[PDB]
């Protein structure tokens, strides 16, 4: 009854509305504002400690809330827990599947999550059982390899897979609490907010989409990049974030503006982004490449603040600690490297 | 002070776990990993593994195991959306998502009382009324038709043959977007890539899966992170591509114009009883694949074309000899001797 035609016309008018809304809200840029600020201190960090031990390629990690413990997973099928101070690995735990792709350390230091090609989020009671860590939960699968799972508390987690669908779970009951099905590609990177009330997911749709743990819907959307988004991380304020994809550039997206801000790239680079992080303040943006090297950028002048090199293989992950003291990095040569 | 003993205990735990991890590295360095993709059934990897080896048990074990989880999932999902069933339901709630527990014999006694209560997945009423059929059993067709188990993530099988450990794995239940999960395979020793020919095609759909196989092989061979691993290429459906060729019944010439002026190589070894008109076509496909294999070869990864034989006992021998050749060529490239 010609209802689809009117629905499509209304949808097209709606889609055109956002263009004019963003054009009205884009009166200036950040370069015109950051001209007066003086340049960044040129920083080249040094490798303070190297953490040997893994037999094969590592893939992810997560700084503990105590700025001391690290959890690293390698292709050998074993997660080891570090002590960044003494460089003294506290213990290792094998896996059921040899292929793991993401880790997660609890904000309280009690549980540890593991995900990979097994399509199973395995949670482990790090401190319970009065002994060796045991398998606490094996969250149900959803036809997609886990690319990123993170803890917002000890009672529930949030995972993302390659089925273009994220899932906020409930560890106690071990079932899907909220399903997020608003993607056309592999959902890869997650990053919770300071208030843990919402997050933004970066997938292979060349787009970062903000979700909400309460209603389970998409409030905003960002379609700036050109290739598959690999990493994403919030500015430490909950009003903006940074995305890194295979187009060899990192971009800053604000929430209240709903628009791109700055792009970070050079001409003599082609390697895609593998991991993006900030500092404690948020002025330095840490981006790992595939040229066996990573770069620290300025999050306000788009200038290369410096380089961090020392891996003979492609870097896989990087993360800053709570007090912004150290920058851990990790490459496929079984090597983690702490910087400061 | 008292921190010294704590530091020394931490160091002792380190020494123990490192003594374990050295041997774990020794073990991992001696297992060759093989990747199987292409087929739409993981069981194709469980048959060849059943010809020698925990897989020697009957296939009824796995099917009966996929029947003890449906009832648990249904009873856990039905009661989660809601007289003396508190301590009886607490144990069931604590037995949720327990991998090594499965179903004890005392669970039916606690579940029958909850099922008898008048107040209390899609297919959940058939596998819940006959909760008294537990034994040791022998499922029927109507029960297997209603059972809907989730897609098994990765079929992983570590076996040991001829005093060497092999780790063969099939990747199923995943999406057809093969972009970001192939990267996870670099330490693999070989990718066994199986190809099929045309099917019955009778109402011809005309999908031309062969050219898509060429394109996927070109994308995998010329990958940046797969430049050191080798591909053992098998050509299945050798019997279906034999009686369907004849003299003009196969549409292989319409899909490849170069097949007309193509000739059978002199160094070929046709099976005793193979016609020239089918031998030429059987070698044309391997020549087309080697046209991509012989190019971009930096002496760093090669290909091993082999026809799928009828006897399932010699495909394993082909794989073993190919693994030996892979290790040999890697070692020769190590010392700059090749």
């Amino acid at each position: 009854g010609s209802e689809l035609d009117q629905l499509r016309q209304e949808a097209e008018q709606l889609k055109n509305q956002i263009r004019d809304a963003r054009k009205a809200c884009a009166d200036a840029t950040l370069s015109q504002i950051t001209n007066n600020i003086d340049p960044v201190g040129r920083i080249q960090m040094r490798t303070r400690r190297t953490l040997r031990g893994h037999l094969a390629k590592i893939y992810a990690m997560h700084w503990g809330t105590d700025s001391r413990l690290l959890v690293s997973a390698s292709q050998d099928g074993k997660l080891i827990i570090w002590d960044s101070y003494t460089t003294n690995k506290v213990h290792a735990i094998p896996l059921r599947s040899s292929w793991v792709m993401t880790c997660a350390y609890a904000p309280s230091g009690n549980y540890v999550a593991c995900g990979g090609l097994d399509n199973i989020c395995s949670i482990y009671n790090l401190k319970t059982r009065e002994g060796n860590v045991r398998v606490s939960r094996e969250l149900a699968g959803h036809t997609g390899y886990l690319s990123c799972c993170r803890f917002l508390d000890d009672n529930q987690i949030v995972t993302s897979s390659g089925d273009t669908t994220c899932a906020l779970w409930d560890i106690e009951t071990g079932q899907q609490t909220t399903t997020f099905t608003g993607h056309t590609g592999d959902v890869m990177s997650l990053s919770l907010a300071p208030d843990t009330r919402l997050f933004v997911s970066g997938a292979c749709d060349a787009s970062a989409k903000l979700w909400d743990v309460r209603e389970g819907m998409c409030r905003q959307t960002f379609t700036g990049h050109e290739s598959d988004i690999n990493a994403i991380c919030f500015f430490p304020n909950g009003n903006a974030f940074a995305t890194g994809s295979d187009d060899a550039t990192c971009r800053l997206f604000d929430l209240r503006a709903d628009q791109e801000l700055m792009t970070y790239s050079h001409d003599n680079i082609i390697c895609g982004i593998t991991s993006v992080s900030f500092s404690k303040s948020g002025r330095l943006l840490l981006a790992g490449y595939d040229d066996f090297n990573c770069n620290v950028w300025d999050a306000l002048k788009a200038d290369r603040a410096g380089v961090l090199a020392g891996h003979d293989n492609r870097v896989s992950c990087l993360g800053v600690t709570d007090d912004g003291m150290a920058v851990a990095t990790g490459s496929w040569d079984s090597f983690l490297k702490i910087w400061n | 002070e008292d921190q010294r003993n704590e530091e020394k205990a931490q160091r002792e735990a380190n020494k123990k776990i490192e003594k374990q991890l050295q041997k774990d590295k020794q073990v991992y360095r001696a297992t060759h990993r093989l990747l199987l993709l292409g087929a739409g059934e993981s069981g194709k990897s469980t048959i060849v593994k059943q010809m020698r080896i925990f897989n020697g048990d009957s296939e009824k074990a796995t099917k009966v195991q996929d029947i003890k989880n449906n009832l648990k999932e249904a009873i856990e999902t039905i009661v989660a959306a809601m007289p003396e069933n508190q301590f009886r339901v607490d144990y069931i709630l604590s037995v949720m998502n327990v991998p090594d527990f499965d179903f004890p014999p005392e669970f039916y006694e606690h579940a029958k009382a909850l099922w008898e209560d008048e107040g209390v997945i899609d297919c959940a009423q058939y596998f819940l009324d006959k909760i008294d059929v537990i034994k040791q059993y022998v499922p029927s067709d109507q029960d297997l038709l209603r059972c809907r188990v989730l897609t098994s993530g990765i079929f992983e099988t570590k076996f040991q043959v001829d005093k060497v450990n092999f780790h063969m794995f099939d990747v199923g239940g995943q999406r057809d977007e093969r972009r970001k999960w192939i990267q996870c395979f670099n330490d693999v020793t070989a990718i066994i890539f199986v190809v099929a020919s045309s099917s019955y095609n009778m109402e011809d759909n005309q999908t031309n899966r062969l050219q898509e196989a060429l394109n996927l092989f070109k994308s995998i061979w010329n990958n940046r992170w797969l430049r050191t691993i080798s591909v053992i290429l098998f050509l299945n459906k050798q019997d279906l591509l034999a009686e369907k060729v004849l003299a003009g019944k196969s549409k292989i010439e319409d899909y490849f114009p170069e097949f007309a002026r193509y000739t059978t190589p002199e160094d070929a070894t046709p099976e005793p009883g193979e016609d020239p008109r089918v031998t030429r076509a059987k070698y044309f496909i391997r020549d087309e694949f080697l046209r991509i294999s012989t190019a971009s070869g930096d002496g760093r990864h090669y290909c091993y074309p082999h026809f799928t034989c009828a006897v399932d006992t010699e495909n394993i021998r082909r794989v073993f000899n190919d693994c030996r050749d892979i290790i040999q060529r890697m070692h020769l490239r190590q010392y700059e001797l090749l």
Epitope: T164, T184, G185, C204, D205, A206, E226, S227, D228, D246, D247, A248, I270, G272 | R175, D176, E177, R178, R179, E212, N215, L216, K218, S219, I220, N222, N223, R224
Partner: nanobody, 128 residues
Framework: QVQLQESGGGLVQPGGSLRLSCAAS????????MNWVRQAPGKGLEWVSD????????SYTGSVKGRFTISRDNAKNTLYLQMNSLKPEDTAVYYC?????????????????????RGQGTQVTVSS
């Protein structure tokens, strides 16, 4: 966003010719290996052609080898495919897909209709 709009298509008697075009935006069109992808009604997706980042490798499908002519202009950010000697077996919907990896020779565009770097294609049939 990264949009890929296809033009052309329509009804034409068997044996005729027809040219169709793909206009892409939102990215640097010059440095991406591109290609097309057909889909026959009631059949899986199928491959036809390919363009390098400069025009070097022009791979065709043997079913259309030496018959269709593909080209592209990096200045105008456009890519054209011209079908000569159209057959009654080519009645299908054609999509303009692109490889995701910049500066690479690996591609994974044929999918189960979830690939994002591929716009809505144009319909082409034959007469009787």
């Amino acid at each position: 966003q990264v949009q890929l709009q296809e033009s052309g298509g329509g009804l034409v008697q068997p044996g005729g010719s027809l040219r169709l075009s793909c206009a892409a935006s939102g990215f640097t069109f010059s440095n991406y290996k591109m290609n097309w992808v057909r889909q026959a009604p009631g059949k899986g997706l199928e491959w036809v052609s390919d363009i390098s980042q400069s025009g070097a490798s022009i791979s065709y499908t043997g079913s259309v080898k030496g018959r269709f002519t593909i080209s592209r202009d990096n200045a105008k950010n456009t890519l054209y495919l011209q079908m000569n000697s159209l057959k009654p077996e080519d009645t299908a919907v054609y999509y303009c897909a692109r490889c995701p990896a910049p500066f690479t020779r690996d591609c994974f565009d044929v999918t189960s209709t979830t690939y994002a770097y591929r716009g809505q294609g144009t319909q082409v049939t034959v007469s009787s």
